């Protein structure tokens, strides 16, 4: 259905077995995204901290 894919498509062994990939145009890795750690509400008895 398409002649070429130009996208953030990761070079993987299972894909390379059925399609061709150029050498990498971008280096990367899996990472963790978290919601930021906002400031906590001061707890009762936080005067002992």
């Amino acid at each position: 259905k398409a002649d070429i894919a130009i996208a953030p498509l990761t070079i993987t062994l299972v894909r390379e077995e059925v399609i061709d990939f150029s050498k990498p145009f971008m280096s990367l890795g899996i990472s963790i995204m978290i919601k930021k750690p906002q400031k906590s509400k001061p707890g009762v008895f936080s005067f002992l901290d």
């Binding site: 259905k1 398409a2 002649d3 070429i4 894919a5 130009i6 996208a7 953030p8």
Partner: peptide, 29 residues
């Protein structure tokens, strides 16, 4: 003749231009 490129709407690699409805073909992205 014209190469059909498959791609994905994934920011910031490919995004719809703010005025894409007024543009044609490759100029929409």
């Amino acid at each position: 003749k014209t190469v059909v490129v498959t791609t994905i709407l994934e920011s910031p690699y490919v995004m719809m231009k703010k005025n894409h409805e007024m543009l044609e073909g490759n100029e929409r992205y």
